[PDB]
Design a protein around this ligand. Structure first.
Ligand SMILES: *[C@@H]1O[C@H](CO)[C@@H](O[C@@H]2O[C@H](CO)[C@@H](O)[C@H](O)[C@H]2NC(C)=O)[C@H](O)[C@H]1NC(C)=O
Ligand SMILES: *[C@@H]1O[C@H](CO)[C@@H](O[C@@H]2O[C@H](CO)[C@@H](O)[C@H](O)[C@H]2NC(C)=O)[C@H](O)[C@H]1NC(C)=O
Ligand SMILES: CC(C)(C)C[C@H](NC(=O)c1ccc(Oc2ccccc2)nc1)C(=O)O
Length: 654
């Protein structure tokens, strides 16, 4: 059909083995910067001793640098604090003597080439956090609960506050943190104070009170605020770093419920609101571009009460595509997919040449169900969660089940080349997979109960595979290492030999497999989100289209480390479909027109009475966030008020 000829020769001289002799227990692997090849391995032992290795050739060869950390014991709760981008910043937390005045850290800012030692004025409680803006700025919590900041990459530490619960870096070196007054974090649960410092502990602005907790997501700063003389709380959103606050149009919750930021960006948020009483599911709400107005997107969305597992996934290889698991009335789990930012959810189309399993009532008609965080949690035979990379357009890889729900059977692997619109069985039985060279190479390793000595590769996006032997002595496979970003052609296989056992790492380079670099001819045109090509509006998702240039399945070549996904948008005309109901409006029947409510019930009346001037007055409609349509329809009607309609029933004081 189609395979690589004389491949065995091209890979043999490019297979680079490494034995990690004195290795057991812990095994931390950290990549340091992009286009560097710097990897750090950290093995800890318990009576203990710590070992540290460093590669500079993508894991092909390491050199023991335990000497650089004076062989001392390193705490793995803090792991390896690696700095942003290509700063080269690396921080290791050392375990210290019982009665010491403060902790100790090993800091390298030259890609682990040289480690300085530093004794701290406090005992750290959290892993130190690098300011996204400035790699030299760090923050940490002491075991005493004090917020310590550093401006010189952890050399000198200053205690900027003394009773902090949670602290986070914002954009432009801002620090947000909750503070308690009486007992502890647990005693003042819902009675904390949200503060902020733009001048690194110089000044402070109390941006919130009666605080339960806070979180950042995209352009937003969320904070859950406790109800006065009540056991409940609700969401409050600020988009100006705490200066102005607004109550989110969302249900309030009790103490046994939560709010989870499923996903957030520069346009909107996906918020999971927990269902009252141990149900193991909630409801997804999609926000407007202000993070204030919320549209109910998905019901009975599976998110566990203990452990907090959810199969909620962003199919990062196609714009507007997300998959998750819902809980059926009949207590079965089905996988749903949204192609339009959670506007509409539906089942995944089963692959053409696949039969329905025992879970399906009709042996002809059924769907594809994906195994993710939840299946894994239930100790099912799922070695990997769904995988997609933004640079490898349309490709989604996952362990699935074809039927009416997620089955307990041993899953085969499924691939989509168009962002989840159509599927096909990639491999049979569980595997571990990786996407090299922005979709140029897909790599697979079998999930076995006994040793393996083989790797499988594909140069046509999982349509055709090829077996390769990387070792004479088989290993008990553990996992795959590859450079974040899915741009390298360097894959590190990991595992341990048969015992008196020891860890090993074989790194295969695909430079010779893809000796030719891609040229203009190798790429083809591809309209993302196609359904009916006859249609003028075909591919319009969120008011616009995107046409891509994609490497041909046939074309086997290297996209290159500098590959730039080339796409062109087509601005479609506005329909009502590009608008969500603002506050006080609803879409009855099938109809796409936003009509005013007869009267506001539940959390809608709660907003109506305790909101603010801007959101309470409405155009009826609001443009869907991320929606970039032009022309066509527009909601033409005056910006009307509702603070009269709600209070109209309430007898008013004089
Ligand atoms: C789902 O994933 C996509 C792709 O990873 C996110 O989109 C990117 O967002 C960043 C934000 O800074 C942009 O600079 C990129 O241009 C976006 N990538 C692409 C390919 O569009 C998206 O935000 C994620 N969804 C949510 C809700 O966070
Ligand atoms: C795979 O690993 C090799 C190193 O083992 C990478 O080689 C680097 O290549 C760049 C140019 O592409 C050079 O500037 C570096 O000096 C090379 N480093 C070494 C140690 O040889 C190679 O880039 C990796 N392959 C891919 C596709 O990322
Ligand atoms: C701070 C903000 C705005 C994010 C809300 C806040 N959130 C949270 O406390 C919160 C709790 C849990 C959780 O996941 C789970 C983890 C384990 C088990 C079950 C669930 N995720 C988030 C709140 O509920 O008030």
């Amino acid at each position: 059909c189609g395979r690589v000829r004389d491949f065995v020769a091209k890979l043999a001289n490019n297979t680079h083995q490494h034995v990690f002799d004195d290795l057991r227990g812990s095994v931390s692997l950290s990549w340091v910067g992009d286009s560097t090849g710097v990897i750090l391995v950290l093995t800890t032992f318990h009576v203990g001793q710590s070992k540290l290795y460093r590669s500079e050739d993508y894991g092909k060869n390491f050199k023991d640098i335990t000497d650089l950390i004076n062989n001392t014991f390193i705490r793995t709760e803090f792991g390896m604090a690696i700095g942003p981008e290509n700063s080269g910043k690396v921080v290791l937390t050392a375990e210290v003597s019982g009665g010491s005045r403060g902790g100790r850290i090993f800091r390298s800012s030259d890609f682990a080439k040289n480690f300085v030692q530093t004794d701290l004025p406090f005992h750290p409680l959290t892993q130190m956090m690098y300011s996204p803006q400035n790699s030299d700025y760090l923050l940490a919590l002491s075991t005493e609960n004090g917020l310590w900041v550093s401006k010189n990459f952890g050399g000198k530490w200053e205690e900027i506050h003394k009773a902090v619960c949670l602290a986070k870096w914002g954009s432009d070196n801002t620090i947000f943190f909750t503070t308690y007054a009486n007992g502890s974090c647990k005693a003042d649960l819902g009675a904390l104070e949200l503060w902020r410092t733009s001048d690194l502990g110089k000044s402070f602005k109390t941006i919130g009170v009666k605080i339960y907790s806070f979180g950042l997501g995209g352009r937003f700063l969320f904070a859950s605020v406790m109800a006065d003389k009540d056991t409940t709380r609700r969401i409050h959103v600020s988009t100006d770093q705490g200066d102005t606050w607004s109550m989110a149009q969302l249900p309030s919750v009790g103490q046994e419920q939560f709010y989870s930021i499923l996903a957030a960006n520069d346009d909107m948020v996906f918020m999971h609101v927990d269902e009252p009483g141990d149900t193991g599911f909630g409801t997804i709400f999609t926000s407007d571009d202000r993070g204030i107005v919320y549209s109910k997107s998905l019901d009975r969305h599976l998110y566990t009460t203990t452990g907090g597992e959810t199969d909620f996934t962003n199919v990062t290889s196609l714009r507007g595509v997300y998959i998750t698991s819902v809980l059926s009335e009949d207590n079965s789990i089905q996988t749903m997919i949204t192609f339009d930012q959670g506007g509409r959810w539906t089942h995944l189309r089963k692959p053409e040449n696949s039969e329905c399993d025992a879970t399906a009532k009709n042996k002809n008609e059924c769907s594809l169900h994906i195994h993710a965080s939840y299946s894994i949690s239930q100790k099912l035979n799922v070695p990997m969660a769904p995988l997609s990379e933004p640079n490898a357009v349309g490709i989604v890889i996952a362990h699935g089940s074809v039927g009416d729900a997620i089955s307990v059977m041993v899953p085969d692997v499924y691939i989509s080349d168009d962002g989840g619109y159509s599927w096909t069985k990639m491999l049979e039985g569980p595997h571990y997979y990786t996407i090299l060279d922005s979709g140029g190479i897909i790599v697979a390793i079998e999930h076995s109960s006994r040793p393996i000595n083989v790797i499988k590769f594909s140069t046509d996006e999982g349509q055709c595979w090829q077996t390769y032997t990387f070792t004479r002595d088989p290993i008990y496979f553990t996992g795959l290492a590859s450079e974040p970003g899915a741009r390298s052609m360097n894959i590190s296989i990991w595992g341990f030999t048969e015992s008196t056992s020891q860890w090993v790492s074989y790194t295969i380079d695909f430079k010779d497999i893809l000796e030719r670099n891609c040229e203009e001819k190798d790429y083809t045109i591809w309209l993302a989100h196609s359904t009916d090509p006859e249609d003028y509006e075909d591919g319009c998702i969120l008011g616009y289209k995107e046409q891509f240039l994609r490497l041909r399945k046939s074309s086997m070549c290297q996209n290159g480390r500098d590959y730039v996904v080339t796409k062109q948008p087509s601005i479609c005309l506005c329909s009502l479909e590009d608008f969500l109901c603002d506050f006080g409006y609803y879409r009855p029947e099938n109809d796409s027109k936003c009509v005013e409510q007869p009267e506001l019930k539940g959390h809608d009346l709660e907003f109506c009475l305790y909101g603010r001037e801007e959101h309470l007055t409405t155009n009826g409609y609001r443009k869907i966030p991320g929606d970039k349509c032009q022309g066509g329809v527009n909601p033409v009607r005056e910006v009307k008020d509702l603070k009269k309609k709600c209070t109209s029933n309430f007898l008013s004081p004089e």
